[PDB]
């Protein structure tokens, strides 16, 4: 129950007005950052206003950035006097079975892991405020994974054109979209020196002789389907064969003992499928309903099993 | 054996919920639901059944991972070095000369790391073993910052450790981890942690150890039954904090990790392993690795390697500093306390 | 209370639950007429000074 | 918590042997979930998909240990759940890698060579608990070896691990069981390089941020451009757009590669390492 649960114990101070107490019972299924593991804390931790900065409250894409530095919990039960999280890196619960809350617009499936992003959609910012006390809660949103890879990559890229739409998405049918932001440019720095060593350190001498191949990709495209749907109608391999006549060099430093390619693979693989993790953070979370459906609509809680 | 400060000497005993919790099953009623509306031994063999009966009468108590390997004593020695120390796994080194032959870059020598291994074993003889950490220590005593507690490491390691020759046994080994780095296969590719020590069992040229892959520490049976208790120790050489070098002096349960740090140059490399204490999330680690050893970033692919290695569950952590007797000799040694072990895997650099 | 159905295998989510419920009482009321002439009310009445 | 899996019947002398044999063997399942059918487990449940169809199969199914086999019945530990409850649970190799203590251990499709139930009408493929550095290895070996046939070495086809030899090779229907693995890794290597290449000297943006990019391109990344560049070029061009869908792509390319492990072995009053075929005791909590 140390190593199985971990009560992290939020306490409730004495002064919250009966309408803002029972806001709190609402609060189910959330994600709540603690800084530490200590056994007692308080809602001043856990509130926004312990994630401001001297004079400044970070845009949406700097909210990311100091999650990670913290650990996610989820609120177990809602007492009058205290609210009890488990921290998801430590231990679960007994059985390791713990309940989340869709606050997405986005209903779940079985076995996908879920990363949680900061309330970037739009009609969607909802931050339970304490108005006895003058604390607000950002809940972030628990999202599944082909979404929370691209909706972090749509304010990537958008920070890098206020450096010189974008902001709309789509998932199974459901046109969505988030809210247009100005972002910090301290913010985007991070985020650009991230993804160029990430990018540069991708690359290697093998990579070369997979150059040479890409007119034969668009020798493949004309045939395949498969391959006429795989690399876009707006890719760029399509557009950089028309200008770019790769080749490889005839000879390799020590190319006897060496391999070419099987080093081109570990290397992009340690960058850049590595690349999505060190933006976000890790969907440590997946969600196996024993027994009730296999997709889990939104506002509905959903059982979590630990994701290595 | 039912004392009177009870509400306490019944706490410990594993309560009163369970007798309550039994009490509306079990105690009450015919409900669940119903109708409507022979002289000095024998006794003392005999009530060691008795206590054999007093072990069935009855039976928090954590669990564990316990594990055994039958381990040469050649690199380590569990004899010399009390229980409780870190220990290391390897894999075994036929993989060696094949994976140096293609994971060095081009331009350096591949014929190194076997050449250099195979010295070792003919230098310890005058097989998947286990590296000791304080053995660790003297071999990278050479790239340190406190050089002389790495000296107070090699004082104690080449008069307690069983064999001939240890300095031989160091100065060769750590000669394969500078082959270890230059040919590219990095140490943490080798090194596998295997857990911390509890006991052993003697015998010629091989020992058997025992210890716990996985839980905490201080509870098992160590086989004394007067100290069933044995505390971590770690040389000072290898223990770095984070806590007060970023300032972060907050309670808390701190992390245990271990790191290398990666020095790539010609016939010049150097090897540090270090004991990272730590309130950090393990994905907000990298980053501090980037503020303080940017050194070895310019003079060599990433300088850093690390993995968990275990946790404090204390809220405020407490640490020692202490100078403690190998044998005869005074070692600066850091010991912890409270320590729950859960391993991890590396991370990468190429 | 609400109500609970019991299941087997790996039990992802449950816990009993009550509610309070309270509705707001809506006060109305009746009105009747009723008149007398002074012609009965000697009668009623008693005698007079 | 232990799981159950129904034989139905009909079971000749043989089909009920053959399922006495595969004792300590892995299973993937849909849910976690009491009562089950064995049409569920076999390969007619997947359907013939490819390397690339079985990892995304084996990520969003459940595997489960079978332990001790009923004749009427399959009872099958979820490494999920069951695991962190019960101590440890056995589990037979299927591999030619022989297990060593402390390893963790994830599994890979049958690329490599299977249990048929005829009386059933059925097949049963299994995955190869094999180690996770082995694991990263033996995958990207096969992805370089498909990209040659699109146009190899005499070494590459051979590993080692503790002293045992593997040969790769031991083909063509495993190339083509393969050809769409091959037809991703090299897209989004080809539109990432092109990505790095059409930015770098696109912005180069500038005080201290394309300072220390081009610190890090002296003569290594701008070297690397200017080789490139060479057999190469320099209206709109959709930069920024293609990043999202790139990101998406090769982010996605990295789970599906990533191979997680599952089991890690703590042996105890046993060998240290375990050979093949061999039963290893087996946990998943600490």
Same mark, same amino acid.
């Given at each position: 129950?140390?190593?199985?649960?971990?009560?992290?114990?939020?306490?409730?101070?004495?002064?919250?007005?009966?309408?803002?107490?029972?806001?709190?019972?609402?609060?189910?299924?959330?994600?709540?950052?603690?800084?530490?593991?200590?056994?007692?804390?308080?809602?001043?931790?856990?509130?926004?206003?312990?994630?401001?900065?001297?004079?400044?409250?970070?845009?949406?894409?700097?909210?990311? !950035?100091?999650?990670?530095? @913290? /650990? $996610?919990?989820?609120?177990?039960?809602? &007492?009058?006097?205290? #609210? =009890? *999280?488990?921290? +998801?890196?430590?231990?679960?619960?007994?059985?390791?079975?713990?309940?989340?809350?869709?606050?997405?617009?986005?209903?779940?499936?079985?076995?996908?892991?879920?990363?949680?992003?900061?309330?970037?959609?739009?009609?969607?910012?909802?931050?339970?405020?304490?108005?006895? !006390?003058?604390?607000?809660? @950002? /809940? $972030?949103?628990?999202?599944?994974?082909? &979404?929370?890879?691209? #909706? =972090? *990559?749509?304010? +990537?890229?958008?920070?890098?054109?206020?450096?010189?739409?974008?902001?709309?998405?789509?998932?199974?049918?459901?046109?969505?979209?988030?809210?247009?932001?100005?972002?910090?440019?301290?913010?985007?720095?991070?985020?650009?020196?991230?993804?160029?060593?990430?990018?540069?350190?991708?690359?290697?001498?093998?990579?070369?002789?997979?150059?040479?191949?890409?007119?034969?990709?668009?020798?493949?495209?004309?045939?395949?389907?498969?391959?006429?749907?795989?690399?876009?109608?707006?890719?760029?391999?399509?557009?950089?064969?028309?200008?770019?006549?790769?080749?490889?060099?005839?000879?390799?430093?020590?190319?006897?003992?060496?391999?070419?390619?099987?080093?081109?693979?570990?290397?992009?693989?340690?960058?850049?499928?590595?690349?999505?993790?060190?933006?976000?953070?890790?969907?440590?979370?997946?969600?196996?309903?024993?027994?009730?459906?296999?997709?889990?609509?939104?506002?509905?809680?959903?059982?979590?099993?630990?994701?290595? | 054996?039912?004392?009177?400060?009870?509400?306490?000497?019944?706490?410990?005993?594993?309560?009163?919920?369970?007798?309550?919790?039994?009490?509306?099953?079990?105690?009450?009623?015919?409900?669940?639901?119903?109708?409507?509306?022979?002289?000095?031994?024998?006794?003392?063999?005999?009530?060691?059944?008795?206590?054999?009966?007093?072990?069935?009468?009855?039976?928090?108590?954590?669990?564990?991972?316990?594990?055994?390997?039958?381990?040469?004593?050649?690199?380590?020695?569990?004899?010399?070095?009390?229980?409780?120390?870190?220990?290391?796994?390897?894999?075994?080194?036929?993989?060696?000369?094949?994976?140096?032959?293609?994971?060095?870059?081009?331009?350096?020598?591949?014929?190194?790391?076997?050449?250099?291994?195979?010295?070792?074993?003919?230098?310890?003889?005058?097989?998947?073993?286990?590296?000791?950490?304080?053995?660790?220590?003297?071999?990278?005593?050479?790239?340190?910052?406190?050089?002389?507690?790495?000296?107070?490491?090699?004082?104690?390691?080449?008069?307690?450790?069983?064999?001939?020759?240890?300095?031989?046994?160091?100065?060769?080994?750590?000669?394969?981890?500078?082959?270890?780095?230059?040919?590219?296969?990095?140490?943490?590719?080798?090194?596998?942690?295997?857990?911390?020590?509890?006991?052993?069992?003697?015998?010629?040229?091989?020992?058997?150890?025992?210890?716990?892959?996985?839980?905490?520490?201080?509870?098992?049976?160590?086989?004394?039954?007067?100290?069933?208790?044995?505390?971590?120790?770690?040389?000072?050489?290898?223990?770095?904090?984070?806590?007060?070098?970023?300032?972060?002096?907050?309670?808390?349960?701190?992390?245990?990790?271990?790191?290398?740090?990666?020095?790539?140059?010609?016939?010049?490399?150097?090897?540090?392993?270090?004991?990272?204490?730590?309130?950090?999330?393990?994905?907000?680690?990298?980053?501090?690795?980037?503020?303080?050893?940017?050194?070895?970033?310019?003079?060599?692919?990433?300088?850093?390697?690390?993995?968990?290695?275990?946790?404090?569950?204390?809220?405020?952590?407490?640490?020692?500093?202490?100078?403690?007797?190998?044998?005869?000799?005074?070692?600066?040694?850091?010991?912890?306390?409270?320590?729950?072990?859960?391993?991890?895997?590396?991370?990468?650099?190429? | 209370?609400?109500?609970?159905?019991?299941?087997?295998?790996?039990?992802?989510?449950?816990?009993?639950?009550?509610?309070?419920?309270?509705?707001?009482?809506?006060?109305?009321?009746?009105?009747?007429?009723?008149?007398?002439?002074?012609?009965?009310?000697?009668?009623?009445?008693?005698?007079?000074?």
């Amino acid at each position: 129950m140390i190593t199985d649960c971990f009560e992290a114990d939020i306490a409730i101070p004495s002064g919250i007005s009966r309408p803002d107490a029972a806001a709190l019972q609402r609060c189910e299924g959330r994600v709540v950052f603690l800084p530490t593991i200590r056994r007692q804390l308080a809602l001043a931790d856990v509130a926004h206003e312990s994630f401001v900065s001297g004079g400044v409250s970070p845009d949406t894409l700097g909210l990311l !950035l100091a999650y990670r530095r @913290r /650990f $996610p919990a989820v609120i177990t039960r809602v &007492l009058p006097t205290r #609210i =009890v *999280a488990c921290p +998801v890196d430590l231990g679960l619960t007994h059985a390791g079975t713990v309940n989340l809350r869709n606050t997405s617009p986005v209903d779940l499936c079985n076995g996908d892991p879920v990363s949680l992003v900061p309330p970037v959609f739009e009609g969607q910012a909802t931050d339970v405020r304490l108005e006895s !006390l003058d604390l607000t809660l @950002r /809940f $972030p949103v628990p999202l599944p994974t082909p &979404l929370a890879r691209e #909706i =972090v *990559a749509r304010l +990537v890229a958008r920070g890098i054109r206020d450096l010189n739409d974008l902001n709309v998405l789509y998932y199974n049918g459901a046109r969505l979209s988030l809210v247009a932001d100005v972002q910090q440019l301290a913010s985007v720095n991070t985020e650009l020196r991230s993804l160029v060593l990430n990018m540069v350190y991708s690359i290697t001498e093998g990579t070369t002789l997979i150059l040479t191949l890409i007119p034969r990709l668009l020798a493949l495209s004309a045939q395949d389907g498969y391959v006429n749907a795989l690399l876009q109608m707006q890719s760029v391999t399509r557009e950089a064969a028309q200008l770019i006549h790769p080749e490889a060099p005839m000879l390799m430093q020590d190319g006897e003992r060496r391999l070419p390619l099987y080093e081109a693979l570990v290397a992009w693989l340690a960058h850049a499928g590595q690349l999505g993790d060190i933006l976000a953070l890790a969907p440590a979370v997946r969600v196996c309903t024993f027994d009730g459906a296999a997709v889990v609509q939104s506002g509905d809680m959903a059982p979590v099993i630990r994701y290595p | 054996t039912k004392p009177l400060p009870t509400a306490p000497m019944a706490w410990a005993e594993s309560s009163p919920r369970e007798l309550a919790g039994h009490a509306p099953l079990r105690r009450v009623l015919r409900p669940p639901i119903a109708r409507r509306d022979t002289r000095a031994t024998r006794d003392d063999t005999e009530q060691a059944v008795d206590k054999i009966l007093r072990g069935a009468r009855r039976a928090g108590a954590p669990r564990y991972h316990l594990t055994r390997q039958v381990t040469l004593t050649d690199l380590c020695q569990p004899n010399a070095e009390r229980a409780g120390a870190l220990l290391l796994a390897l894999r075994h080194p036929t993989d060696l000369p094949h994976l140096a032959r293609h994971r060095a870059p081009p331009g350096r020598q591949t014929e190194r790391l076997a050449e250099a291994w195979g010295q070792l074993l003919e230098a310890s003889a005058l097989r998947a073993g286990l590296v000791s950490f304080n053995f660790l220590v003297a071999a990278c005593a050479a790239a340190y910052d406190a050089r002389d507690a790495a000296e107070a490491v090699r004082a104690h390691i080449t008069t307690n450790y069983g064999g001939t020759r240890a300095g031989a046994r160091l100065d060769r080994f750590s000669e394969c981890l500078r082959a270890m780095v230059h040919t590219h296969v990095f140490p943490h590719e080798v090194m596998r942690f295997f857990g911390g020590l509890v006991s052993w069992v003697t015998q010629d040229e091989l020992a058997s150890v025992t210890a716990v892959c996985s839980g905490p520490q201080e509870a098992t049976h160590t086989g004394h039954p007067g100290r069933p208790r044995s505390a971590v120790t770690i040389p000072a050489c290898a223990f770095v904090d984070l806590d007060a070098e970023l300032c972060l002096g907050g309670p808390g349960a701190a992390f245990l990790y271990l790191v290398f740090t990666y020095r790539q140059c010609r016939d010049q490399e150097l090897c540090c392993v270090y004991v990272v204490k730590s309130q950090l999330p393990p994905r907000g680690l990298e980053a501090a690795l980037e503020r303080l050893f940017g050194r070895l970033r310019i003079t060599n692919c990433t300088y850093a390697a690390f993995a968990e290695l275990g946790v404090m569950p204390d809220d405020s952590p407490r640490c020692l500093h202490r100078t403690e007797r190998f044998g005869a000799v005074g070692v600066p040694v850091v010991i912890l306390e409270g320590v729950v072990w859960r391993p991890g895997g590396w991370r990468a650099c190429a | 209370h609400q109500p609970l159905i019991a299941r087997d295998g790996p039990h992802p989510v449950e816990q009993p639950v009550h509610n309070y419920m309270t509705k707001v009482i809506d006060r109305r009321a009746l009105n009747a007429a009723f008149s007398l002439a002074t012609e009965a009310i000697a009668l009623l009445t008693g005698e007079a000074l």
